Design a protein around this ligand. Structure first.
Ligand code: HEC
Ligand code: HEC
Ligand SMILES: [Zn+2]
Ligand SMILES: [Zn+2]
Lengths: 136, 136
């Protein structure tokens, strides 16, 4: 019961983006420009429906470079993945959590069954462990 | 001929993003966090093919707020649109250029037939006048 690498995630629905800069509490390890993506099943859940099993959310994290009052996307640091399965991932609230170093399928990062990821996302119990909100 | 409003662009392919902060040359009016989206026809040109008629690129521009060293997306300021049609938009190199204030269909920003946008995009004549490049 590993989380699947979310192949083709780059062509999913772009939910939102955020920049975390030096100084911010999450600078380590979430510093950079991040983009959130969702497959069709996650949109149902994001829209106010419930999350079908098979819903995947992706946090895509880039380093950035300062270029004359512009922040420009550099190298991918990692992707974080949440994969909905109420039964398979019941231990961390129905979502499996995984990280892939630099987005690579072979650089699995999570060593504790997702407990560490889950400890922070649990703050969002009432929105089903998802921080991002859909926007227009 | 008017550039058509690109309905549904938000569910298109996310090409890339960039932040333009106060002091950048493009600050006025392109300051903020922007995301580039491309329809299926535009992806063909991005991938090295010719841009077919009906290709559409969108520049989606948000204001942002700086909050404890995070940049957080606020309100949409505008979208910029490029619509491909070699015949109808030959005057501006085969792309029609339009701005929609706040992303609303009824707030057209361009008043000079697109020559102002074309004047700068012509620098990238070699790339069919598109600055953005597909990244992974
Ligand atoms: C707090 C200390 C966190 C830890 C540890 C982890 N995550 Fe997280 N995550 C956090 C915030 C504040 C957000 C919202 C970001 C935004 O732009 O709003 C997120 C987001 C995600 C997402 C996108 C879906 C969502 O919940 O908004 C995914 C797919 C995600 N996170 C996965 C993830 C994994 C796999 C983690 C451990 C390796 C992990 N997160 C840790 C806060 C925190
Ligand atoms: C230089 C002074 C510019 C003027 C005037 C206009 N644009 Fe532009 N545009 C510019 C750059 C450097 C970029 C790339 C930004 C990035 O993230 O790399 C853009 C981008 C676009 C896009 C996205 C597709 C692409 O070419 O990368 C669109 C749809 C776009 N611009 C439209 C547009 C319109 C409608 C303009 C006049 C209202 C316009 N642009 C002006 C540089 C400049
Ligand atoms: Zn900083
Ligand atoms: Zn300066």
């Amino acid at each position: 019961t590993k989380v699947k690498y979310p192949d083709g995630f780059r062509s999913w629905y772009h939910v939102k983006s955020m920049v975390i800069q030096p100084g911010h509490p999450l600078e380590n390890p979430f510093g950079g420009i991040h983009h959130v993506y969702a497959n069709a099943e996650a949109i149902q859940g994001l829209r106010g429906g419930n999350y079908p099993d098979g819903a995947v959310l992706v946090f895509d994290l880039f380093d950035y470079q300062e270029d004359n009052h512009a922040l420009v996307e550099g190298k991918r640091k990692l992707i974080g993945v949440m994969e909905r399965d109420a039964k398979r991932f019941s231990a961390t609230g129905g979502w499996g959590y995984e990280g892939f170093g630099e987005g690579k399928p072979d650089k699995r990062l999570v060593t504790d069954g997702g407990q560490g990821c889950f400890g922070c996302h649990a703050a969002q119990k009432e929105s089903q462990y998802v921080f991002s909100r859909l926007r227009d």
